[PDB]
Each structure stands twice: as C-alpha cells, then as structure tokens.
Design an enzyme around this catalytic site. Structure first.
Site, PDB file in Angstrom:
ATOM      1  N   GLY A  27     -21.132 -48.896  23.634  1.00  0.00           N
ATOM      2  CA  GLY A  27     -20.333 -48.185  24.163  1.00  0.00           C
ATOM      3  C   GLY A  27     -20.603 -47.272  25.121  1.00  0.00           C
ATOM      4  O   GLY A  27     -21.888 -46.895  25.254  1.00  0.00           O
ATOM      5  N   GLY A  29     -19.672 -43.887  25.258  1.00  0.00           N
ATOM      6  CA  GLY A  29     -19.893 -42.871  24.325  1.00  0.00           C
ATOM      7  C   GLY A  29     -19.392 -41.644  24.990  1.00  0.00           C
ATOM      8  O   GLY A  29     -18.587 -41.762  25.994  1.00  0.00           O
ATOM      9  N   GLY A  32     -22.471 -39.651  26.732  1.00  0.00           N
ATOM     10  CA  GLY A  32     -23.919 -40.648  27.031  1.00  0.00           C
ATOM     11  C   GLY A  32     -23.780 -41.809  26.444  1.00  0.00           C
ATOM     12  O   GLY A  32     -23.158 -42.070  25.309  1.00  0.00           O
ATOM     13  N   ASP A 159     -19.478 -35.364  14.725  1.00  0.00           N
ATOM     14  CA  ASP A 159     -18.762 -34.531  15.728  1.00  0.00           C
ATOM     15  C   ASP A 159     -18.720 -35.429  16.883  1.00  0.00           C
ATOM     16  O   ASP A 159     -18.503 -34.633  18.054  1.00  0.00           O
ATOM     17  CB  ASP A 159     -19.528 -33.237  16.035  1.00  0.00           C
ATOM     18  CG  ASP A 159     -21.124 -33.416  16.618  1.00  0.00           C
ATOM     19  OD1 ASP A 159     -21.421 -34.772  16.455  1.00  0.00           O
ATOM     20  OD2 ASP A 159     -21.463 -32.465  17.344  1.00  0.00           O
TER      21      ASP A 159
END
Ligand SMILES: COc1ccc(OC)c(CCC(=O)Nc2cc(-c3sc(/N=N/c4ccccc4)nc3-c3ccc(F)cc3)ccn2)c1
Ligand SMILES: CCCCCCCCO[C@@H]1O[C@H](CO)[C@@H](O)[C@H](O)[C@H]1O
Ligand SMILES: CCCCCCCCO[C@@H]1O[C@H](CO)[C@@H](O)[C@H](O)[C@H]1O
Ligand SMILES: CCCCCCCCO[C@@H]1O[C@H](CO)[C@@H](O)[C@H](O)[C@H]1O
EC number: 2.7.11.24
Length: 333
Positions: A27, A29, A32, A159
């Site tokens: 993906g 992200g 990033g 997170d």
C-alpha cells in the site's frame, strides 16, 4: 555496511540491503510506501516502510525523529517494535531516505467473539498500555484499525493502520481540553471492548457534537463533583444548559454480557478521567483472572521526551535522526 540493491515498485524507488528479498508492495502507507518482504538473515516475514519526504519541513523532520525515537524505545510483546532501521546513505551529507522494518502483520482488530476472546484481546491491550503509560507516553488514538491481531489471537498496539477515529476518542479531547491524562486511552479501550461484546460501535457519532451527545446518553451529564473542575466558562455554561440525563445502568445496556465485563466497562467509561481505572489497575480486575500475572506485566524504561518542546532547524532534526539510525542495535534471536 550491508550491500544494497535498488528496484522500483509502485512508481517509487527502493534501495534496501540484500537481506530483504521478495519485496511486494502492500500500500501507499500513512506517510510512506510499504512493502512486504522476506528477511533472509532472521527467516522472518517483515514489513519495510520507506518514509515519504521525511525531512521536507520542520514538522516533517520532527515527526520523522519522533517516529524513530518511539519505535526504537518500544520493547514489549503487545506493542509494535523495530526490527531494523536503515538508509542507503553513507554519510549525513547524503542522508535523505529512512526505512523502517518490523514484523509483517496481517489483520487488524476489525478483520478478527466469545467472552474468552474478548478477555484475551482486551487483556493484551491493557498489558501493552501499562507498558506505554509507564514511559509517560499517551497513545491518544486507540481504535481497532490500530491493533494488529494474529490467527493466534496475539495482539500488538500500533500507531497506524494496516472506523472513524472520533468514535473511540475520550470526550475531553473533543472539548479541546488543555491537558490530558493517560486515561484518555482507557476510554478508548472501553469503547473497543464494548464493540467486541456487542458487535456494534458504541458511539458512532457523525461529528464531535453528535459524539458527545451519544456519550452523555450512556454515562449521564456531569455531576457537580466534575463541574467544579471545568475551567472553561463556555464549556461549563453549555454543559449545564443541557437537559440533565441519568447515567444508565450498564447491565441494561450490555444485557447478557459477562457481569464482570459490564463492571469493567463501568470503571472505564467514566466522564471524569480522574476516576477512570488505570491500565495497571485494570489488569488486576477479576475479568482477567485467567490471564493476569503480576510478574509478567512489565513496565518500560524511561523515555526522554524533552525533544518535543524544542524548535530546531530541519538539518538538526535530520542529524538527530541520523544519530538514531547509526546507533540502532537490532533485537537478538
Ligand atoms: C489481507 O490484507 C493483507 C494481505 C496481505 C498482506 O501482505 C502481502 C498485507 C499487508 C498488511 C500490512 O499492511 N502489513 C503491515 C503494515 C505495516 C505498516 S502500515 C503503515 N502505514 N500504513 C498506514 C496507511 C494509512 C494510514 C495509516 C497507516 N506502516 C507500517 C509500518 C510501520 C512500521 C514499520 F517499521 C514498517 C511498516 C507494518 C507491518 N505490517 C495485507
Ligand atoms: C536470495 C537471498 C540473498 C540474501 C543475501 C543476503 C546477503 C547478506 O550479505 C552480507 O554481506 C556482507 C558482505 O559479504 C557480510 O559481511 C554479511 O555478513 C552478510 O550478511
Ligand atoms: C509504539 C507505536 C504505537 C504506540 C504509539 C504510542 C504513542 C503515540 O505517541 C504520540 O504521537 C503523537 C502524534 O505523533 C505525538 O504528538 C505525541 O507526542 C506522541 O506521544
Ligand atoms: C459533556 C462532556 C463532558 C466532558 C468531561 C470530561 C472530563 C474529563 O475529566 C477531566 O479531565 C481533565 C483533563 O485530563 C482533568 O484535568 C480533570 O481533572 C478531569 O476531571
């Protein structure tokens, strides 16, 4: 220094050590791109994240430094940890890219209940939360998409995602409270646990106002004990100008659930954050009797957060990040 190899994936370049093979993009992200890969050195399947423009600005650079400092500190079974961090740069002067490596994770808490499973999953959250809170770290954004779960039903706090954030947010956050205590996270755990017991989002507010309105319908409007701690003249006026509502009995709301689970929810979903049960106290709640072990619920080493109050230049956060890349010691086998 390892030998690097270079390849383009999803229209972005990747330069990683040879040990990481079979890179497969998963993906775009958060901040990033991410690829799955096979770590030939350890035999582990891993995720490698290439940060996007990590030193573009001061905010970006501090955020990059913050993320690396956090991941390097976290050493706990129920919290995401850092397998590796690397850069193709041979010196600070050419340092522009940061890559983070951790265990590859499949599903988040949405993609995965019996009461035993709820016990085990919430227990692992609280155990990771005890560790995080002991380091004076507040998550502030706990939600099912931030919790990775195995088929083993093993759980880690993240997170990032692999479900509106507002649904799990403590009410003091949405009132833009100046200061926050660690039990903002306990509120989120309460919302998550209620959802695992009922199969429904507890407070699916359409916005912050609708959110608070749903919350008050369950827990009741503030009593005078809480009102005398509200400093905002405006917040106080509005709260008091509402039609008072009684705190519902959670037994009626969570009918048929384990009465120990109902009792724990009542100790978590309290408006007054000073009265919410802590993570350490919650691990000793009778609901977790078959998992609780006071000798295997460790606390964290102290975490130096003083950098959060500093205003530094881009190149300074970049240099401090480089220091942390260089000083990294991988976890043993
Ligand atoms: C059925 O579904 C799948 C099937 C097969 C799969 O594999 C082939 C996968 C791959 C699952 C996956 O995504 N696994 C994963 C991701 C990360 C992430 S995700 C992220 N940001 N993502 C965002 C994006 C948007 C918003 C917020 C966050 N960052 C890191 C990350 C963090 C630290 C680190 F050191 C390395 C990577 C870390 C570990 N596993 C799924
Ligand atoms: C197809 C999978 C290939 C994996 C190759 C991993 C190579 C790791 O190559 C590294 O090379 C260095 C220089 O020779 C050595 O000093 C390191 O010990 C070694 O791990
Ligand atoms: C270990 C990684 C998953 C758990 C992370 C818990 C801590 C999240 O950390 C928080 O992130 C916020 C946004 O960057 C920062 O503003 C806070 O200062 C930081 O404490
Ligand atoms: C209708 C919305 C009511 C929101 C009530 C939120 C009460 C939160 O609780 C408050 O949190 C503050 C910040 O951590 C603490 O300083 C206060 O002592 C505590 O009572």
């Amino acid at each position: 220094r390892p030998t690097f190899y270079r390849q383009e994936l999803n229209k972005t370049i990747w330069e990683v050590p040879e040990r990481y093979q079979n890179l497969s993009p998963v993906g775009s992200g958060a901040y990033g791109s991410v690829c799955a890969a096979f770590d030939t050195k350890t035999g582990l399947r891993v995720a490698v994240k290439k940060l996007s423009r990590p030193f573009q600005s001061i905010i970006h650079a501090k955020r990059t430094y913050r993320e690396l400092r956090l991941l390097k500190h976290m050493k706990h079974e129920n919290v995401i940890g850092l397998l590796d961090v690397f850069t193709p740069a041979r010196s600070l002067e050419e340092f522009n890219d940061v890559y983070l490596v951790t265990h590859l994770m499949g599903a988040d808490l949405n993609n995965i209940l019996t009461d035993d499973h709820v016990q085990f999953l919430i227990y692992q959250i609280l155990r990771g939360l005890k560790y995080i809170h002991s380091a004076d770290i507040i998550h502030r954004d706990l939600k099912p998409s931030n919790l990775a779960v195995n088929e083993d039903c093993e759980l880690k706090i993240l997170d990032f995602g692999l479900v509106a954030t507002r649904w799990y947010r403590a009410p003091e956050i949405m009132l833009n409270w100046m200061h926050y205590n660690q039990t903002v996270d306990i509120w989120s755990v309460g919302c998550i646990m209620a959802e695992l017991l009922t199969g429904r989002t507890l407070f699916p507010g359409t916005d912050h106002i609708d959110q608070l309105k749903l919350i008050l319908r369950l827990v009741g409007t503030p009593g005078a004990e809480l009102l005398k701690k509200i400093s905002s003249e405006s917040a106080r006026n509005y709260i008091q100008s509402l039609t008072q509502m009684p705190k519902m009995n959670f037994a009626n709301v969570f009918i048929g659930a384990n009465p120990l689970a109902v009792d724990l929810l009542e100790k978590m979903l309290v408006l007054d954050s000073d009265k919410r049960i802590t993570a350490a106290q919650a691990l000793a709640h009778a609901y977790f009797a078959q998992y609780h072990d006071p000798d295997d619920e460790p606390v964290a080493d102290p975490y130096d957060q003083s950098f959060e109050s500093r205003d530094l230049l881009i190149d300074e956060w970049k240099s401090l990040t480089y220091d942390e890349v260089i000083s990294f010691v991988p976890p043993p086998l």
